[PDB]
Amino acid sequence: HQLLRYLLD
Amino acid sequence: MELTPDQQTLLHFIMDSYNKEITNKILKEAFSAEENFLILTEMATNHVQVLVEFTKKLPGFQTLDHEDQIALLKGSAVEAMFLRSAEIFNKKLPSGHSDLLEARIRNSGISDEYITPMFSFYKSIGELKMTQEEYALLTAIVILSPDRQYIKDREAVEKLQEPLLDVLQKLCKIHQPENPQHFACLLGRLTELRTFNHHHAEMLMSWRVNDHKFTPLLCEIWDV
Numbered sequence: 696h697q698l699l700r701y702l703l704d
Numbered sequence: 705m706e707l708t709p710d711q712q713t714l715l716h717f718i719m720d721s722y723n724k725e726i727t728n729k730i731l732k733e734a735f736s737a738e739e740n741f742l743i744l745t746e747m748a749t750n751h752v753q754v755l756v757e758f759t760k761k762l763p764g765f766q767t768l769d770h771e772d773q774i775a776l777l778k779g780s781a782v783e784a785m786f787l788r789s790a791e792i793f794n795k796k797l798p799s800g801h802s803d804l805l806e807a808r809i810r811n812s813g814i815s816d817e818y819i820t821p822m823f824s825f826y827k828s829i830g831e832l833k834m835t836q837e838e839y840a841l842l843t844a845i846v847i848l849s850p851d852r853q854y855i856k857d858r859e860a861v862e863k864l865q866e867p868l869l870d871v872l873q874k875l876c877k878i879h880q881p882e883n884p885q886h887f888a889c890l891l892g893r894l895t896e897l898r899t900f901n902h903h904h905a906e907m908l909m910s911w912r913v914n915d916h917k918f919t920p921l922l923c924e925i926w927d928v
C-alpha cells in the first residue's frame with residue numbers, strides 16, 4: 696500500500 | 705573452492721547494506737505490560753524501517769516489478785524480524801540489557817505458548833555460531849523467496865536468490881569447516897523460521913482482543 700510504496704521510493 | 709570475484713562483489717554489497725540499530729532507549733522507560741508493549745512495537749517499527757532500506761539495496765531488487773517488490777517485503781517482514789531477534793538474543797550485550805529485553809517481551813501481552821517456541825528457536829540459532837555474514841545472507845535469502853504469495857514473476861526472484869544461496873554454501877565451508885552439515889543446518893532453521901508467520905498472526909489477534917494499538921508502519925506491513 697501507499698506507506699510501503701513511499702518507503703520503497 | 706573459495707569465492708569467485710563476482711561472489712566477493714556480491715558479499716561485500718550485502719555486508720555494507722546489512723551493517724547500517726533497533727535498540728535506542730529501552731532502559732529510559734518503566735516496566736509494566738503497557739510500556740513493554742509500546743517499546744516492543746517501537747523496536748519492531750525501527751526494524752521495518754531498516755528492513756526496507758536493506759531490501760531496496762539488494763542486487764537486482766530495483767529491476768523487479770513494483771508489485772513484486774511489495775509482495776516480497778510484506779511476505780518476509782515477520783521472518784526477518786524473528787531472525788534479527790534471534791541474532792540479538794545471541795548477541796553479547798552489556799550486563800543486564802539482554803535480561804531487560806527478555807523480561808520486557810515476557811510481560812508484553814504475549815502468551816508463554818508463543819514465548820516458549822520463540823526462545824527455543826533463538827537458543828537453537830545461537831548453537832550454530834553464525835557470523836555477521838551468515839545473518840546478512842540468510843536475511844537476503846528470506847527476503848528474496850520465490851515462493852511468496854502475489855509474485856507475478858517468480859523466475860526473476862529465483863534468479864536473484866540463487867547466487868546468494870551459492871555464496872552461503874561457500875561461507876559455511878570457510879567459517880564452519882569441521883561441521884559439513886552446517887549449510888543444511890542453516891536451511892533447517894529457515895524452515896523453523898517460517899512457523900513464526902502463524903505464531904505472529906496468533907499473537908496479533910490476541911493483542912487486538914485486548915485493544916492494543918499498533919504504529920502506522922506495523923499496521924501497513926502486518927495488515928492489522
Ligand SMILES: O=C(/C=C/c1ccc(F)cc1)N(C(=O)NC1CCCCC1)C1CCCCC1
Pocket residue numbers: 726744747748751785788789790792793794802805806809822904907
Ligand atoms: O523476541 C524479540 C522480538 C519479539 C517480537 C516482536 C514483535 C512481535 F509482534 C512479536 C514478537 N526480541 C527483540 O529484541 N525484538 C525487537 C523487535 C523486533 C526487531 C528486533 C528487536 C528479543 C527479546 C529477547 C532478547 C533478544 C531480542
